[PDB]
């Protein structure tokens, strides 16, 4: 009934605009986004929207965009986000663009308190964010207040300590100075290597109840399912890795986890609505497929990207060593000039 279907897609660092047709599929829109930004490791990603009832939802790529209850507005608003997380960033985020998108999203969740982080880890993470953004600490340029314009720490860390912004800056600067010589893209990777070991990293939590009506959390992540106490989302009460699951299923509100081990009982929980159980199961199927895929041989495409990454890295290392050595040749000629 509108004459246009204008669409905005916001990534962690760009705003894109499209204009689609009534029969445009999720996959078609998704493919236009990733082509625009130059992303190839697309498997981790999704397009998230707000439905007409205000719930964050993933666009289904196998359905028409207009058939999915996207909040009606001009333009339609999507967030391009990592939906699935690797088991190890160093092994599995091959390309620098992939690493940057993950870094920006994870850092958002740390800073907004979504992903719990202890204070000392938050300062260490902030130091790598700073090395990436500023490069090497340089006492001629980075004076007191060089970080004053930056959101660097989780709100919980700021609120629960007594330090002022200057004291926080000095703690982060100590670490910043330790990173001198570290390439910006390497500091991004070091950030992610720390963040991926946080207890809440890469976990989707769903509110559930047991048969007695006690509130619990279900987590879904790369490695399987977990049951948590209502009041602790850090440490699972019961873990259900893939290797221990025989079947997961649902029937309206009831979700059943059937174990491989014949001695162990079924785990049953209840969601508020069928739609939630469908969301859980879809996320479990996506995760388990990626789990299996990373244990099978690399596709030809993945091999290509890995060989391109090795060659580009090898080349940049060589050019960097050449420039350092030329700088020494210059500094030598500047000082044997004076004689």
């Amino acid at each position: 009934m509108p004459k246009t279907i204008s669409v905005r897609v916001t990534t962690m660092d760009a705003e894109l605009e499209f204009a689609i047709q009534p029969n445009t599929t999720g996959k078609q829109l998704f493919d236009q986004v990733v082509k625009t930004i130059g992303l190839r490791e697309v498997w981790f990603f999704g397009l998230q929207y707000q439905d007409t009832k205000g719930f964050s939802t993933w666009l289904k790529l196998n359905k028409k965009v207009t058939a999915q209850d996207v909040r009606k507005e001009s333009p339609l608003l999507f967030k391009f986000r990592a939906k699935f997380y690797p088991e190890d960033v160093s092994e599995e985020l091959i390309q620098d663009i992939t690493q940057r998108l993950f870094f920006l999203q994870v850092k958002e969740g740390i800073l907004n308190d979504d992903i719990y982080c202890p204070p000392e880890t938050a300062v260490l993470l902030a130091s790598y964010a700073v090395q990436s953004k500023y490069g090497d600490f340089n006492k001629e340029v980075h004076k007191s207040g060089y970080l004053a314009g930056d959101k660097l720490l989780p709100q919980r860390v700021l609120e629960q300590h007594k330090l002022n912004k200057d004291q926080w800056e000095e703690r982060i600067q100590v670490w910043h100075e330790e990173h001198r010589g570290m390439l910006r893209e390497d500091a991004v990777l070091e950030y992610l290597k720390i963040a991926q070991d946080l207890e809440m990293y890469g976990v989707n939590y769903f509110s559930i109840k047991n048969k007695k009506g006690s509130e619990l959390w279900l987590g879904v992540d790369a490695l399987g399912l977990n049951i948590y106490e209502q009041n602790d989302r850090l440490t699972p009460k019961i873990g259900f890795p893939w290797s221990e699951i025989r079947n997961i299923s649902f029937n309206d509100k009831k979700f059943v986890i059937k174990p491989i081990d014949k001695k162990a009982p079924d785990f049953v929980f209840y969601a508020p609505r069928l739609r939630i159980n469908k969301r859980i199961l879809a996320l479990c199927m996506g995760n388990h497929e990626l789990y299996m895929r990373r244990r099978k041989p690399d596709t030809i495409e993945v091999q290509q990207m890995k060989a391109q990454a090795r060659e580009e890295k090898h080349q940049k290392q060589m050019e960097r060593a050449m420039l350092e050595n030329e700088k020494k040749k210059r500094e030598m000629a500047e000082k044997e000039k004076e004689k």
């Binding site: 029969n23 999720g26 996959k27 697309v42 990603f45 196998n62 996506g286 497929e289």
Partner: peptide
């Protein structure tokens, strides 16, 4: 042109 059969940007195997 809705031939992509899967919910995400990778195939689900049987």
């Amino acid at each position: 042109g809705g031939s992509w059969k899967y919910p995400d940007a990778f195939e689900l195997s049987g």
